[PDB]
Each structure stands twice: as C-alpha cells, then as structure tokens.
Curated annotation (Swiss-Prot), chain B:
Protein name: Delta-aminolevulinic acid dehydratase
Residues of the full protein shown: 148 to 294 of 342
Active site: K63 (schiff-base intermediate with substrate), K116 (schiff-base intermediate with substrate)
Comment field (misc): Present with 11600 molecules/cell in log phase SD medium.
Source organism (scientific name): Saccharomyces cerevisiae (strain ATCC 204508 / S288c)
Residues the record lists as binding 5-aminolevulinate 1: R73, R85
Length: 340, 147, 340, 340
C-alpha cells in the first residue's frame, strides 16, 4: 500500500525561518518599503479646445476629453477626495491647428495654457504638471520637428520643446514633463527655465525611461496623437534595451531632471528598480499607461482578476520597485479605496 | 490542528516527494510550496539518495501571493480551504523578504531560481539577477498573467 | 600488499555540490550567460579596386579579395543563410593611390564607398559596418598622419579620420569602426557626425581595446596594410597593458562610442571581461583576428584540435567573457553550424 | 579631383591623451601589472614506471616520458638554468596496474612517489607539486570512483582522492594539486592533511576552475589517461559556465585551497580575471595545456606566428589576467629567454 513517506530531518536552521515576519496583516504592511498614500497619485487630464466638451474616450474606460467649462464640476469632487496633482494633456480638435513645428503646442489660447490658468484660479492648491511634447500638435504626429527624410531633427526639436516647456511654466505650470524622448532635450529645457528665471520654481519631471511598445494604444484615441509615416521606434527605447535605459536615466539626471518617470510601469518594473539605484536621490514616478490600465479592465470584465485587487497589487508593485509617485487613470478609484 | 502550516512535517514530506520524483526519473525538481527551509531538506534528501549530482533543484525562491493564480486553480483544482496562502507566499510589497528568501534558497542548495509571478514582479527578477548572479533565473508567466 | 586506502569522510556539505546544475546537455545550455545566435555574427569583406577581383589570400584560408562585380553572387548565399552584417575593408591596388594623408580612404570611386553603394542597393537589409583607418591608404602604411620624425600626428590624424568616417556614413554606412587607436579620435568622429547630422543614424563601434601583437599577420596580406619604418607599438596597446586598456575603454565610452570592440579576442578574454564591467551598458564585440583564425586552422590540420569544436569553444568563450557581437572569418561556417 | 578632407578640430582634451604612458620600451614594462620571472614557472613531468624510460610523446613536441634513472641528467641543466618547481604526473605502464579504484595512484613503488623520493634527494631545493587524480590509474579512465551506472561516486571518490593526496605529502610532496574536479574534494583533502599533521607544510593548489574542452588531447597521449564509456562533461565545467566557475572558485577557497589553478589558460583568460577578484588573497596559477601548447607549435610551423613571440604574448597574457604562477611546457625555453 502506498503510504506517505517522511524523510529524516535535521533541527530547523534559524536562517531558514522567515515566517515570523509576515504572519499578521499589520506585518505585511510593515514589510512594505513604502506605503501608498493619496498624495502620491497624479491624475491625467485631456483638455479639449472645445470648452463645453465632455466626450468619452472609447479605448479609455471611465475617462473623457474635458473642456474648460466642464473642469470645475469634474475636479471639485476629486479634490475634495484628496487629489493633490494632475498632469495636463492638450487635445486641440479645431482644424488647421496642427502643423510641422507644433506651433499650437504653446498657444496661449490652447487647451493646455487655458487649463493651467483655470486650475490656478479655481483650484489654487492643486499641483499642475504639464506633459511636454509636439506629437499632439504636429501634422505628422511625431514627438519632434522632422527632417525632410522623415527622421527626427534633434536641434530644432529640443529648441522647440524647450520653448514650449518654458511657456507652460510662464503660464503657471508648477512642473514640466517632457515625454518626447529626444536626445538632450532635458538640458535645453533646464537652460531655458534658467534664462526665464523659472528654474527655482519649476520641477522638471523627465520621462527618462520611456520604452516603445504595444501599450500606448488607448492614449492615441484620447489625444489623437498617432504617428504618421512610421513608428517611434527610433526615439523611444527598445523593450530589450536595458543599457540604453540606464544611460538615459543617468543622462537626464545629469541634465537637470528633478525627478524621473518610468513608462510603461508594470511591464517595466525592473527598469524602475534600476532607476531607484541610479537616481537614488531623486523621486521616481511610475506611469500606468492606457494599455496597462485598459488591460486590467479587460481582464476584470473577463473575470480573470478583480479590479480593486489587481489595481492595488500593480500599484503596490510600483512602490516596491522604488517609485514614490504614480500617474494613473485609477486615481479616482484610489481616492476612495485609500479611505477604507 | 489550528490550520497553520507545520514546517517540520511539511518539509519532511516535501523532501520525500521530491526525491521520489527524481527516483522515478525526473531530471529536475521545483518546490513551489514556499515553506521555510524546504530547499535544504530536499537537497539533503537527494544527497542521501545519491541523486544530487543528477538532479537540478529549481526553487521557487520568490513566489508572491496575489490575484494572478486563478486559472491555475481550475486546471489542477488546487485551491485553498479555510484561508489563503498569505502566510507562506510572500506579500506583494515584501521586497526585503523576497531578497532574503533568494539568498536563503541559494545557500540551501538551489541550482536555479524561479520568480513567480513574472511581469508583475520584474523588479524582483532584477534583484534576483544580482543576488543569484551565478545561477540561472527563471520567469514563470502565471495563468493569471497569461489569461 | 598495496591496497586502496579510503580516508574517513564527513557528511557531504550542500555548499560543495555543484553537479546538480550541469549533468544534462540542456543544462549546459542554461548555464550559458549568453547563447550564440546568427545575428551576432559580423563577416569581414575585403573589397578590391578591381571590380572583377576574386583573389585568394594565402595567409587567410577560405577568404578572398572581392571586387564589386563579384559581390552579388558571393553575398547571396550567405544572406540567405542568415547573414545580418558585414565589415568593410578596402584594398586599393591601383598604383599611385596611396599617399601621406590617405587621400584615397574616402575616395567615392574607391572600393569601400563603391561597396557601400552596391550593398545598400542589392542587399538593403544587410547592416553595413566600415572599418575606419588610413593604414591601407597611406604610403607609409601607418594608421594615421605622421610627423617628419615618423611619429604619429594626433591632431592631423583624428582630423583626417573624422572626415573619412563621416564620408562613409554619408555614402550610406550604418556604422563606423575606427581601428586606428589614436588618442581621442572617437570624440572628433562623433562631433563630425553630429555636425553632418548623421549621429542619430550612425553607430560608432570603437576599437577601444586594440593590442599590439603577433596575431595580425594574415591580415596584412589580404589588405596589404603593413607598417613601414617601424611598428604600431606606439599606438596599439602593449599586451601587458591592462591599466591603459581600461583607461582606453572609459575614454572611448565617454567620447561617444555606442559599442566597443576588443581585438584580439581569445588572447584577450580578460580584457573583454574588464570591458563588460566598465562598458556594461554598451554592446561589446569580439574580433577573431586573422592570426587567431589561421592558428585554429593550422592546429586543426595538424590534428591538434577539431575545427568545428574549437571554433565553437573559442566563440562561446567570447560570449562567456561578456561579448554579444562577434566579427569572425568563421561566419560562413557558423551560418551552417547554427542550423543544426 | 578627390582631395584629402580634414574636419575642423577642437583643442585636444587631456583625458584623451594616453600615449604619454607607453611611447618607450621601458614604459611598456612599467605598464605591466606583473613581470614574468623564472620563479613563476612550473614544469610538468611525466614519470613512467620504467626507470630507464625516455620516450617521446608524439602529440607533445619536445616532451617525453621519463623514468627515474633518467631524471637526474634531465633535471640538472634545467635546475641550473633556474627551474624552481615541477608538477608530477605518473604514467604506470606495467600491465595489471590499473583498476576500478585507482589503487596504484599512491603505490609507494609507483612513478609518482618514486619520483618524489628521487627529487627530494637529488634536487633538495626544487619545489615538488603532485597532480592528484585517479584518471591515470583507473581501468575506466575517469577521474574518480564510479557508480555501477558509470556516473561519478562523490563520496567514495573524494575519500580515495584525499588518501592519495595525503600519501603524496607523506612521501615528501610539498604541494598537492587535485585536478579531478569532483564536488568537495578540497575539503576532504585539507581535513586529511590536518589529521596527518601535514596541513602546515602542504600547499593545496586546487584546480578550482577546470573546464571541459578540445584542448586536452596531447595530454591523453603522454599519460594515457583517456575516458572510457563517455566524457568528463559531467565533472569538468562547461565552456560557457561562468557562474559555475565562479561558484567553484569560492567553494574551493572556502574549503581550504591555498592557491588555485585555471585550466585551460589562454582560452579562459576571463575566468583568470574573475579568479583574481574572487580569490584576490590567494596566488592564481595558469595552466598552459597540451592543446594550447601544441596549437602554438603548429601555428608556428605553419608560419602563422613566431614561437618565441607568441609564447611571450600568451604567457604575459596570463600575468595580465591576474596569474602569478604558470604551469607550462615552455618552461625550458623561458629559462633561456628570460636570461636575455
Ligand atoms: N508623447 C506623448 C505621450 N506622453 C505620455 C504617453 C501617454 C501614456 C499613455 O498611453 O497613457 C504618451 C503617448 C506616446 O508615447 O505615444
Ligand atoms: N503550489 C502550486 C503552484 N505551483 C506553481 C503555481 C502555478 C502558477 C500558475 O498559476 O500558472 C502554483 C499555484 C499556486 O501557487 O497557487
Ligand atoms: N587598422 C587596421 C586593422 N583593423 C582591424 C585589424 C584587422 C584584424 C585582423 O588581423 O584580422 C587591423 C589590422 C592591424 O591592426 O594591423
Ligand atoms: N586529471 C588529469 C589532468 N590534470 C591536468 C590536465 C592536463 C593538462 C594538459 O592537457 O596539459 C589533465 C588532463 C585532463 O583533464 O583530461
Ligand atoms: Zn510625444
Ligand atoms: Zn590601421
Ligand atoms: Zn583526472
């Protein structure tokens, strides 16, 4: 008869015993290197050039394209729930706005600057972050100014990007986040802020590690910033490029970045860990991209996972990997969940 | 009797099982129990059975508790009863414990280590690549991630 | 009677047991830090100024000096077998071509640029690397412009080398590999590419660690680039110079190199390991030189070793030492071997 | 007309200039981390059980199988030339000597112990090293005692190996070098020496990093120690196994090794470098194996390289990689070369 066999054992080694550290709910909280708080949440906003807008973005569950006149009523509850910061994304829909040099990017009458002014007035305590790029304002849909061949033109690009960033800061943005990924733009932006006497009041949140991938889909729907005549594989880091990512982190830090953003998040947790070592003295931010966000929702609907559970798991993962800030579309949910 | 894991009896039983699989012909054994010090007993068992030189010990050194093991419980019908595995599997926020578990398993004889889940724990894989730099690291794309 | 003695033993220590990790064929593959793939192979090419050339190089078994008109038929099978990249070497044979400043180096009608144009046209998917130096175009046979005393003239040399490199890139080369070993040439080449607006499309593969030795023989036959009035012991690193090699690696990296090459390979595996630590974020390439290559062939003929076996052993050694790319004359063989 | 182009240059950067450190012959010597001296050379000896032997080993140029009665006249000149140490290898040719447990390994009447006694008497100042293994004394040709299945039997093996090592030391060997590569043999050998009260006088030179390869050929001819019924791929490290090699080095050191040997040499220079970091406080020895040695000779005959030149280059390479001792068949040559 097959019976249960038990091998002869040796006395337990103290070094084997780890269980004493997480056998209680409170202990699992104590084991966390960083605890998730409401003030680490950064909610993205898609401001449209139509002040009465409030359009739902198909590929982005529960997220819409808001116009200035609908901002107050939208923000009120969130701010009351503890929202401390937002990241602005402009979505100029009016025809004849987009061009080869992203002129509309810093248009004072544009959605971004209009949004900055509104928020600084209606929600003076909110921290305003502005994404800096040309992709949503270029006729070609690329992040910077191009060469006749269609390839990125570094010099003209960073020159234009620096202007945009300084202009947002001039309008009142507390922080600028260049997501272009073009070589040396951080240095030009920092120098520009210095020359404009705004470097002491403007936080530079660089998307130091932004990889190219299949997770930016839904975003291209909410802001209509899709490439034309190719992909961003030449500026955004290759998914397998750890060395380049590490070099980009060191570069951006050396160029003046006050903090860095890792995008995507979950799919690049190892890069977040690398960043926490290289940029140990700077705040690291995780960006839970549209694709990752939409992926969780899809899986949830399919019953593969539980929304709240996986959201907490994924977000706690960012903190474990070293991040202390999080840009997520789940901000509204967390402002609630963190209360309980 | 209280329902809590019994380390001694557990590793004693697990070691027997692992050695038996190797005796049957398995080239490698991967303990996914996550119970304190099972790697040492399994390695010692293989040594005593004269199979340690032919059996690769692939330890699930870093196995976190989470919401991604669902589908697996359907394919093998191995779902907990009267509680969860939160007392043996590492807490999602537990980086320190994970690092300590990696060092422990390595020191106990593991020939390679497995990180589970994968995608949701890429940072732990990176930690493992430094701590267990001389050993092969394996990623386990779990049912939940796959689904 | 002498009998076999067995000392009293103690229970086996777990820390002693390593055998569990490599007792199976698959395991020995899992133990490899990097696995050899077809796309890591870089095949050198010796383009002659005689379009109908196809001369065999005595000291270089199975290797010849090809002319443009024989390139198509030579490359076809290789590319079909998986060849992804080649490294061009010009061998201008026409008299009155060589001079004191290597004028012919970037001659648009020369073998290198002619080769670039041909390949970009007939094999558009092939990655083109060009070795950058003056040794094969100078009347004196040295790597750079000389002083009246015969000693290397840094300034004029790097100035000329930078021009050559930019010109190859202008012709269409995807990557440039300066093998001159002259102080600070990487910086001038990078700056030159920047000024020519080609730095974003040109990979700079620096021969950061190139030692002087007895293994470059056969090469001097295939390209006729032998020194005149001395040796290269003043620019190429001394075989015992580890400190200088480490300093050269850091220097080249800091000067803009995108990747580095270690030459020779087998005889300098320790330097490859040093490079994998210093230049951890950059791709490291091993160059299996003519002497090493010819040495394996000789030993094989003598029956000392087996060609295929030692080739795999030596090449796997490069990967073990940290390289992820390999320039070897055995490329054709590997394109076959890797299939089985 | 194509003219030589010279790009505009910037003032030379001090950090680019490395040339000032190796522009003179003496400087290239100063750049060496370690200089090659006669006392670092260890000459191998193949003692036969036929006292009047002096047979030439085909696959091993200029090397023979010597009997005790021919040892004096062979050693005299070498010792006079500066030879300070030798490594003994036994080659029992008498029939019925080899068996399943390598009984003859420590046979007092065997070549090794007979050699130790002779040398200690005729050349009292010579340092005697003995290779420790069973391969040359087993009927199966393997390094240790086997299981019925043909697989290595760790326990019985190290038990037998420890006895052999202690016996050689008892006979008068100053140092023992276990080249078996069987898990934990160093610990048993050290413990055995301790129990025999010889640990304070016996240097344990472990072949901590011994890889399996295609370079041990000629050796199997000089000592007739070739495997039977398989290869040594289960005990000797796989060529791609850097992790295992590093673990083996740490293990052997922790087990009592006083020094370590890296075999092969040239083909494993990166491992020598790894060893120089892990075993920084212990002397590292490079073993220029028969295959590597025969390879140099073959290439030399083929005119691919110059014997003396490549020998110096390869041997200086060991020192560069971190070794301070060298076991080489070129010892006789170096005892001459180092004089000039
Ligand atoms: N330069 C645009 C930008 N800045 C931030 C991410 C958006 C992240 C998301 O998809 O939610 C993107 C889109 C892109 O890179 O294509
Ligand atoms: N001890 C069971 C075991 N071993 C491997 C994973 C399966 C991974 C998967 O879900 O695909 C599980 C399930 C569990 O931990 O609940
Ligand atoms: N600057 C020429 C150059 N670039 C690459 C190596 C060729 C490597 C080989 O010999 O195969 C050489 C020859 C030299 O340094 O003498
Ligand atoms: N255990 C035998 C032993 N000890 C040293 C090397 C000899 C090195 C040489 O080939 O010169 C060998 C041979 C082997 O490993 O097959
Ligand atoms: Zn953009
Ligand atoms: Zn040259
Ligand atoms: Zn042996």
């Amino acid at each position: 008869m097959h019976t249960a066999e038990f091998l002869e054992t040796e006395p337990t080694e103290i070094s084997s015993v780890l269980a004493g550290g997480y056998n209680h709910p409170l202990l699992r909280q104590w084991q966390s290197e960083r605890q998730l708080t409401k003030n680490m949440l950064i909610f993205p906003l898609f401001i449209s050039d139509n002040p009465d807008d409030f359009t739902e973005i198909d590929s982005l569950p529960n997220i819409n394209r808001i116009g200035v006149n609908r901002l107050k009523d939208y923000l009120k509850p969130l701010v009351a729930k503890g929202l401390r910061s937002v990241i602005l994304f402009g979505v100029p829909l009016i025809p004849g706005t987009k061009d080869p040099v992203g002129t509309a990017a810093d248009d004072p009458a544009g959605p971004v600057i209009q949004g900055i002014k509104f928020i600084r007035e209606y929600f003076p305590e909110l921290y305003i972050i502005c994404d800096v790029c040309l992709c949503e304002y270029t006729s070609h849909g690329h992040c910077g100014v191009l060469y006749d061949d269609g390839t990125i033109n570094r010099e003209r690009s960073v020159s234009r990007l620096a202007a945009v960033a300084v202009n947002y800061a001039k309008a009142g943005a507390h922080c600028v986040a260049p997501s272009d990924m073009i070589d040396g733009r951080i240095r030009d932006i920092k120098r520009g802020l210095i020359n404009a006497n705004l470097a002491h009041k403007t936080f530079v949140l660089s998307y130091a590690a932004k990889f190219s991938g299949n997770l930016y889909g839904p975003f291209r729907d909410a802001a209509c910033s899709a490439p034309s005549n190719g992909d961003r594989k030449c500026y955004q880091l290759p998914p397998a490029g750890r060395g380049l990512a590490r070099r980009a982190l060191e570069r951006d830090m050396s160029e003046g970045a006050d903090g860095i953003i890792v995008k995507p998040s979950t799919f690049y947790l190892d890069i977040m860990r690398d960043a926490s070592e290289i940029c140990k003295d700077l705040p690291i931010c995780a960006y839970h991209v549209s694709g990752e966000y939409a992926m969780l929702h899809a899986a949830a609907e399919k019953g593969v996972v539980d929304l709240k559970t996986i959201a907490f798991e994924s977000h706690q993962g960012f903190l474990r990997a070293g991040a202390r800030l999080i840009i997520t579309y789940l901000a509204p949910e967390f402002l609630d969940w963190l209360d309980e």
